[PDB]
Structure 1
Amino acid sequence: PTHVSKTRKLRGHVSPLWRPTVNLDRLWTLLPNEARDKYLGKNTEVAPVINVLQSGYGKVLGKGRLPETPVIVQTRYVSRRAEEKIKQAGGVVELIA
């Protein structure tokens, strides 16, 4: 406001390829909370599917540890260490065209 301006007090003083990246530690966070309660920590024959393309991510990177629960990761691209950690956690990677 003009009233609080300090010129009110000077009166009188003479004056590429689109590819957002997601790391492994956030892969389970993308999935909703009720599915995590169902699939995470339980040895179920059916595994959850995390299509990281539908969540606005182009590539899955390898930062972080995944929990030992297997999970199917559907994506376009994946860093070489990321899918190493994925099968070490028991999951598989399905590259999406």
Structure 2
Amino acid sequence: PSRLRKTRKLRGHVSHGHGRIGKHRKHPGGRGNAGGMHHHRINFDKYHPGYFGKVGMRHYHLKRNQSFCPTVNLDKLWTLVSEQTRVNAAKNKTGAAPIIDVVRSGYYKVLGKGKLPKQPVIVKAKFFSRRAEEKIKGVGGACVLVA
């Protein structure tokens, strides 16, 4: 609110908090990003490196659906399915392993980052990382690819 702003305590001071030698003029340094190459060179090089110039190829008609591929990690892999699935699989004596369809959850690619608990799984995903697959194989499990 304007009650608590600084302008309420600036009344009585001639310059209104803007200086007496250099008055608060309209646009002493140009409009917007003016003179980035000329008189704002130091600021645009000390704080915006790479700002000037092009790089890379140009993709004219880019559609995000083609490149849409959310990823999940093995630490969160068990979080997708309910707790009772994991506890029953751990208690299970016949060696049956739960099947985790990460696609139904909404992740296409599985990346292996965290520690995977010692428990057989069947991860049914769309893509797999090399380390993710070898962790699943090492802990004991299967990887199923779906389209």
Q: CA deviation at 1:11?
A: 1.1
Greater gyration radius: 2
Match for residue 49 of structure 1?
99
Match for residue 28 of structure 1?
78
DSSP 3-state at the match of 1:93: strand
Amino acid at match of 1:73: V
1:1-97 counterparts in 2 under 5 A?
A: 1-14=1-14, 15=16, 17-40=67-90, 42-97=92-147
**Cα distance in 2, alignment partners of residues 65 and 43 from structure 1:** 23
Q: For residues 43 and 23 of structure 1, do their structure 2 counterparts lie closer, same or farther at Cα, with a shift above 3 Å needed?
A: farther
> Could you give the per-residue CA deviations for residues 27-81 of structure 1, whole angstroms, max 9, x where no partner exists?
1122112222222364443321111112221211121221221011010000112
Contact 1:50 1:71 in 2 (8 A): yes
**Cα distance in 1, alignment partners of residues 9 and 83 from structure 2:** 58
DSSP 3-state at the match of 2:103: coil
**Quick check: 42-51 or 75-84, which moved more?**
42-51
Gaps of 5+ in 1: none
Q: Alignment length, in residue pairs?
A: 97
Gaps of 5+ in 2: 17-65
Task: Report the aligned-residue RMSD.
Answer: 1.7
Structure number with higher relative contact order (C-alpha < 8 Å, ≥ 6 residues apart): 1
The normalised TM-score by structure 2 is 0.59
In percent, how many aligned pairs have the same letter? 56
The normalised TM-score by structure 1 is 0.86
